[PDB]
Amino acid sequence: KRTHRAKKMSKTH
Amino acid sequence: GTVNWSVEDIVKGINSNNLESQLQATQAARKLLSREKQPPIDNIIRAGLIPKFVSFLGKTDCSPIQFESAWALTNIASGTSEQTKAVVDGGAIPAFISLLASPHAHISEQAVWALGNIAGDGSAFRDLVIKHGAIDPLLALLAVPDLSTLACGYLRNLTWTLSNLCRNKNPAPPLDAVEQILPTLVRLLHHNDPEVLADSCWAISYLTDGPNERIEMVVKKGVVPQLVKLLGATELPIVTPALRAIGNIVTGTDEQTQKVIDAGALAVFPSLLTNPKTNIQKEATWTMSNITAGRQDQIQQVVNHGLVPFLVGVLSKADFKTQKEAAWAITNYTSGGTVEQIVYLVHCGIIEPLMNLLSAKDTKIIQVILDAISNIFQAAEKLGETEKLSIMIEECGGLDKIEALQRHENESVYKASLNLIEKYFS
Numbered sequence: 001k002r003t004h005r006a007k008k009m010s011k012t013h
Numbered sequence: 014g015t016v017n018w019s020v021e022d023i024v025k026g027i028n029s030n031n032l033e034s035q036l037q038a039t040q041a042a043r044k045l046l047s048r049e050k051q052p053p054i055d056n057i058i059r060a061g062l063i064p065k066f067v068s069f070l071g072k073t074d075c076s077p078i079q080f081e082s083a084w085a086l087t088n089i090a091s092g093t094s095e096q097t098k099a100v101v102d103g104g105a106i107p108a109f110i111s112l113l114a115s116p117h118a119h120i121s122e123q124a125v126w127a128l129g130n131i132a133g134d135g136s137a138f139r140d141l142v143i144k145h146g147a148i149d150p151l152l153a154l155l156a157v158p159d160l161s162t163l164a165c166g167y168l169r170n171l172t173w174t175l176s177n178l179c180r181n182k183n184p185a186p187p188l189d190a191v192e193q194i195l196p197t198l199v200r201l202l203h204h205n206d207p208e209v210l211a212d213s214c215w216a217i218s219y220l221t222d223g224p225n226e227r228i229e230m231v232v233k234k235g236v237v238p239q240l241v242k243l244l245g246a247t248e249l250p251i252v253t254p255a256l257r258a259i260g261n262i263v264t265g266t267d268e269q270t271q272k273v274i275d276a277g278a279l280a281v282f283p284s285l286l287t288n289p290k291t292n293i294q295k296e297a298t299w300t301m302s303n304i305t306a307g308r309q310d311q312i313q314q315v316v317n318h319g320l321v322p323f324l325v326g327v328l329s330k331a332d333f334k335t336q337k338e339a340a341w342a343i344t345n346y347t348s349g350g351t352v353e354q355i356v357y358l359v360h361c362g363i364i365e366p367l368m369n370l371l372s373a374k375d376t377k378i379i380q381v382i383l384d385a386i387s388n389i390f391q392a393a394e395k396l397g398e399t400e401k402l403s404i405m406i407e408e409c410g411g412l413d414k415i416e417a418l419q420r421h422e423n424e425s426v427y428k429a430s431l432n433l434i435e436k437y438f439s
Contacts, residue, residue, distance in 0.1 A: 001263075001264045001265075001303050001306050002264070002299075002302065002303065002341065003264055004253065004254075005173075005176065005211075005212065005215040005254070006133075007133040007134070007177070007180075008090070008091040008092070008097070008129075008130045008133045008134070009091060009126075009129075009130065009173075010046075010047075010052070010087070010088045010091035010092075011047065011084060011087055011088060011091075011123075011126065012047050012048075012049060013047070
């Protein structure tokens with residue numbers, strides 16, 4: 001057997 | 014009034030001794046930090062403002078400055094690691110955890126968001142957020158009879174922040190934090206908002222990206238059927254993490270892999286393996302390769318679901334990385350399959366696209382393919398039909414390709430090929 005969501009987000013509005 | 018202040022005006026207001034002047038200046042900072050092009054995070058850090066923002070989070074008597082300071086700090090914490098660290102080093106973590114209990118929803122939500130940014134920096138901050146006691150009050154915000162009564166934006170934020178507590182590796186999150194979060198996550202995964210679903214899938218994908226004991230903690234909660242259902246969703250931002258989680262699960266034991274099969278996953282593969290998004294096709298094929306590394310009764314289910322022709326298809330034409338996953342899937346199938354299963358594979362037309370791939374300049378795919386060919390010959394030996402296969406390989410250009418590879422630079426390649434020629438083509 002062999003082994004995309006943003007990490008951080010700024011608030012703009 | 015608070016549009017486009019300079020940093021020095023912000024500072025002047027923040028150091029006034031006047032809470033309303035301080036509020037105004039904080040909101041001016043929040044608006045600077047909110048703009049799309051090049052928010053001046055470093056300038057605000059260098060003006061020394063983080064400690065003041067952090068003390069404003071504690072002003073229970075002035076809810077708007079709590080909100081503006083929380084928003085300012087959330088946007089500082091959203092930047093590089095060094096920027097997130099300046100927020101943490103100001104003492105923000107405990108102060109945000111205390112605001113989770115605020116009676117003002119928009120404040121509580123801001124604190125959720127900030128903690129998600131902190132935890133999202135990496136393992137160390139994630140674990141520090143956890144040590145400071147963030148998980149109990151985050152989960153208490155979702156302790157309601159019906160998640161549908163929460164504001165949609167607020168639920169989505171909570172879900173994303175929880176997903177960041179589930180994130181990373183080296184190390185993975187503390188086992189006991191994962192145990193504590195999982196029941197809430199299982200509940201979010203049955204919710205009907207597409208972004209909550211996506212982020213819950215992402216969380217489950219992180220928690221299954223690990224050794225078997227990590228996978229097990231997820232599979233034991235019974236989520237595999239729901240993940241299979243999401244696998245079939247029309248929204249790509251759901252299918253992507255659902256497929257990553259399913260893939261991760263099938264890197265575990267053969268019994269974990271069986272749960273995926275039992276829940277009906279294989280029926281979605283004709284569409285995944287033809288999906289117009291090349292990343293889905295690639296991960297779908299990777300996932301197949303780990304299922305074809307299982308037992309013979311598992312290989313048989315791949316066969317019964319009509320998936321061998323779809324593997325011949327992706328081997329024949331797909332993005333190169335997907336083709337490389339397909340080659341793996343075939344070498345795994347041929348290494349564990351019965352004679353009959355291996356014969357079926359040839360009858361589906363595997364040989365010609367396998368041979369076409371030998372002219373790829375990737376020496377890994379070449380070894381994989383040679384191993385597959387050697388395995389298929391091994392099954393033909395047993396039926397006494399090595400000749401019929403030799404001819405089939407010669408007729409589609411495959412003998413020429415293997416001849417050449419005797420003269421290939423890599424050692425296993427020239428060896429493996431020399432062998433096949435010596436053994437089957439002399």
